[PDB]
Amino acid sequence: SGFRKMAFPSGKVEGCMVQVTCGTTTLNGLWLDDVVYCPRHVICTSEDMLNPNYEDLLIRKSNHNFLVQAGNVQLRVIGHSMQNCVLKLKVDTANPKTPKYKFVRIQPGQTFSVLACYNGSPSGVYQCAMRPNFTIKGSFLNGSCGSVGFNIDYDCVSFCYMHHMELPTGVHAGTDLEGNFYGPFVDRQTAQAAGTDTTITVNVLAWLYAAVINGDRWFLNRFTTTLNDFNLVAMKYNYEPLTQDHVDILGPLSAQTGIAVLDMCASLKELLQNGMNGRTILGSALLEDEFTPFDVVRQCSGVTFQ
Amino acid sequence: SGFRKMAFPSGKVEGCMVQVTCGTTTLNGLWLDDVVYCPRHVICTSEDMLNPNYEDLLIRKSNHNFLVQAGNVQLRVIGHSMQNCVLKLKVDTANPKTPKYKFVRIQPGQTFSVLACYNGSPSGVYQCAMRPNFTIKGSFLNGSCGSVGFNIDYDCVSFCYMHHMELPTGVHAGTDLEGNFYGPFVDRQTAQAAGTDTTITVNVLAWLYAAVINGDRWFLNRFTTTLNDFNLVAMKYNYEPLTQDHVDILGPLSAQTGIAVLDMCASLKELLQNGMNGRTILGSALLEDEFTPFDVVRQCSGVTFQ
Ligand SMILES: *[C@H](O)[C@H](C[C@@H]1CCNC1=O)NC(=O)[C@@H]1[C@@H]2[C@H](CN1C(=O)OC(c1ccccc1)c1ccccc1)C2(C)C
Numbered sequence: 017s018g019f020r021k022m023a024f025p026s027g028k029v030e031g032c033m034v035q036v037t038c039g040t041t042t043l044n045g046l047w048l049d050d051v052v053y054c055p056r057h058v059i060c061t062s063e064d065m066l067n068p069n070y071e072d073l074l075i076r077k078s079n080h081n082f083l084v085q086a087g088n089v090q091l092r093v094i095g096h097s098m099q100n101c102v103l104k105l106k107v108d109t110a111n112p113k114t115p116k117y118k119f120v121r122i123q124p125g126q127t128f129s130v131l132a133c134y135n136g137s138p139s140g141v142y143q144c145a146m147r148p149n150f151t152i153k154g155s156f157l158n159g160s161c162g163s164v165g166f167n168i169d170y171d172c173v174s175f176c177y178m179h180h181m182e183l184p185t186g187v188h189a190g191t192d193l194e195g196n197f198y199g200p201f202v203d204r205q206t207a208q209a210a211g212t213d214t215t216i217t218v219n220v221l222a223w224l225y226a227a228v229i230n231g232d233r234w235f236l237n238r239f240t241t242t243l244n245d246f247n248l249v250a251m252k253y254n255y256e257p258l259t260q261d262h263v264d265i266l267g268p269l270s271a272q273t274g275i276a277v278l279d280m281c282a283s284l285k286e287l288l289q290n291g292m293n294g295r296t297i298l299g300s301a302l303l304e305d306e307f308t309p310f311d312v313v314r315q316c317s318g319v320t321f322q
Numbered sequence: 323s324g325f326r327k328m329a330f331p332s333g334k335v336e337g338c339m340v341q342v343t344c345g346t347t348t349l350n351g352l353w354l355d356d357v358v359y360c361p362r363h364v365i366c367t368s369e370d371m372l373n374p375n376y377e378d379l380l381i382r383k384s385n386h387n388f389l390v391q392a393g394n395v396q397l398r399v400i401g402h403s404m405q406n407c408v409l410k411l412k413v414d415t416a417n418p419k420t421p422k423y424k425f426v427r428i429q430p431g432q433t434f435s436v437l438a439c440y441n442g443s444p445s446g447v448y449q450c451a452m453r454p455n456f457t458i459k460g461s462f463l464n465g466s467c468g469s470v471g472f473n474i475d476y477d478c479v480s481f482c483y484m485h486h487m488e489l490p491t492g493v494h495a496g497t498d499l500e501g502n503f504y505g506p507f508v509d510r511q512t513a514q515a516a517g518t519d520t521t522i523t524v525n526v527l528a529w530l531y532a533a534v535i536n537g538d539r540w541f542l543n544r545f546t547t548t549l550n551d552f553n554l555v556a557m558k559y560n561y562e563p564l565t566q567d568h569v570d571i572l573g574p575l576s577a578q579t580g581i582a583v584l585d586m587c588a589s590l591k592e593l594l595q596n597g598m599n600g601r602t603i604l605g606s607a608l609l610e611d612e613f614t615p616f617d618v619v620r621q622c623s624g625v626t627f628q
């Protein structure tokens with residue numbers, strides 16, 4: 017028992033992290049086979065970052081402009097190209113630690129693990145959800161760009177995120193590994209704002225089920241509601257509408273606990289209207305929305321990876 | 323910016339995790355050089371776990387009773403001995419992935435990273451604090467025993483914890499790597515209870531400083547208090563006394579923010595008396611006490627490891 021925000025083991029990703037230096041900019045890159053992937057604003061100066069034109073900036077670069085440090089070993093760049101907002105530096109050495117991998121793009125509401133890195137050296141690991149507004153509430157300091165986000169499925173690493181920037185509210189923005197930004201953001205130091213957020217309704221119900229499995233039962237009740245009439249309360253607590261597919265994916269959790277999905281919604285309706293009155297749920301005094309149904313099932317059953 | 327509960331990269335520990343099977347019991351073990359460390363209750367049956375006598379149980383075991391799986395490779399046991407509550411299985415192969423390491427014992431209030439494992443396969447990683455009562459609020463299912471807790475200092479892994487059991491309240495108990503339990507617990511399936519807990523006062527102040535660095539300032543105030551008179555309020559909110567050494571270790575954080583330690587205590591006194599009135603701090607609606615001063619500094623400056 018116990019519930020606790022849990023990242024994937026980071027080993028397979030740690031073996032891919034390298035340092036990329038161009039001019040004065042130094043950031044992280046991701047070495048898979050004989051390519052190093054990194055955010056394209058490495059070619060920029062600081063006076064270049066206000067309104068760059070990256071594809072003019074890149075024709076002016078040379079292979080030897082790019083200094084690649086894999087730990088205490090230098091890799092020679094033998095080719096460079098730009099795919100959307102990421103750079104692809106073709107190097108003379110294939111990464112011997114290259115895991116089986118895929119490039120996937122995730123959906124807001126889905127989670128992943130972030131391996132925060134500085135100078136090519138992993139610093140720490142933690143879990144993140146992709147918010148409905150395509151930002152992530154991470155922990156990122158200067159020079160963390162090129163840290164990646166990922167999930168693991170047995171032996172295969174699915175990379176979903178590359179860090180690029182922080183927004184004025186303190187949230188973080190980035191792309192997938194094919195270089196396409198999550199959300200309406202550009203890699204220019206200008207006045208971008210996050211867009212309005214909502215609470216991931218299906219995840220909250222997931223976490224409430226995690227709670228019941230771990231013995232937190234005080235918020236339960238005999239009441240029930242219709243899917244329709246819960247969504248009326250959702251709309252006014254800035255929660256997302258719940259769909260019959262969400263009710264489906266909650267099916268396995270409903271079964272284990274014996275609490276129908278619509279009864280838990282009725283329990284949530286009350287939590288929203290009444291608050292929690294000095295009580296906690298899984299050691300939180302807030303309704304938590306960054307655990308997916310698969311996250312709950314994973315941890316309240318305990319899958320593994322190699 | 324951002325604050326987020328962050329574990330150490332787990333790679334160096336992942337390369338040490340193995341599966342130990344004896345009879346019907348299967349648990350995790352820790353392979354450093356030519357030894358595998360694992361909780362001694364692996365020699366037990368289920369009818370042996372109610373009141374074992376381990377040192378009679380062990381003279382009845384043979385080297386070949388112990389089945390050691392390093393991934394898909396079997397290690398032969400060539401020796402076995404008991405040190406306190408852990409077993410030491412001498413194997414014929416030194417672990418080629420053995421990091422530079424130490425065995426340390428941590429102090430309640432200190433944190434570490436846990437790599438939860440099942441069947442020798444790492445499942446996930448997360449941060450934990452050693453509570454004042456020598457328990458830890460982890461996430462552990464059957465068969466997670468032998469998962470270790472650790473910190474990393476550049477390249478050296480300091481192992482501090484080995485999981486053994488869960489208590490009836492759902493908290494977790496274990497030993498250091500020399501086999502000595504944290505707190506007044508024994509590796510017998512009987513009626514042990516955790517002992518009364520308190521809130522780690524120095525950590526809360528640390529986290530409040532983390533908040534101010536990240537822009538959460540609403541709880542600040544011009545007021546001040548004496549170290550004496552804050553400790554009077556501490557005693558009645560089940561907080562630990564604060565000492566002049568805690569004020570010292572908070573010195574660097576006090577300096578960065580320009581908020582004297584005693585002014586933050588006065589800000590905490592108010593939080594305890596008034597609550598938070600619908601507000602949050604670093605996305606928590608509770609006063610959080612599982613971040614050390616070093617944790618805050620580490621993350622609000624961003625150190626790394628190799
Ligand atoms: C890459 O290492 C760095 C990571 C950022 C820096 C601090 N926290 C992070 O996550 N990325 C950047 O610096 C990107 C680069 C330059 C601007 N930028 C960025 O994040 O800017 C924000 C910012 C933006 C507008 C106005 C004010 C600040 C920022 C926030 C805090 C500290 C530094 C920068 C591009 C090419 C987008």
Ligand SMILES: *[C@H](O)[C@H](C[C@@H]1CCNC1=O)NC(=O)[C@@H]1[C@@H]2[C@H](CN1C(=O)OC(c1ccccc1)c1ccccc1)C2(C)C
Nearest residue numbers: 017363371462463464465466467486487488509510511512
């Ligand atoms: C080792 O894999 C296992 C890990 C435990 C099991 C569930 N969560 C965990 O952290 N350790 C044990 O099973 C230890 C072994 C046997 C008893 N034990 C244990 O944790 O018992 C508790 C328990 C204790 C007293 C009364 C009721 C339950 C427990 C809790 C939940 C599920 C199973 C067991 C010793 C040798 C101490």
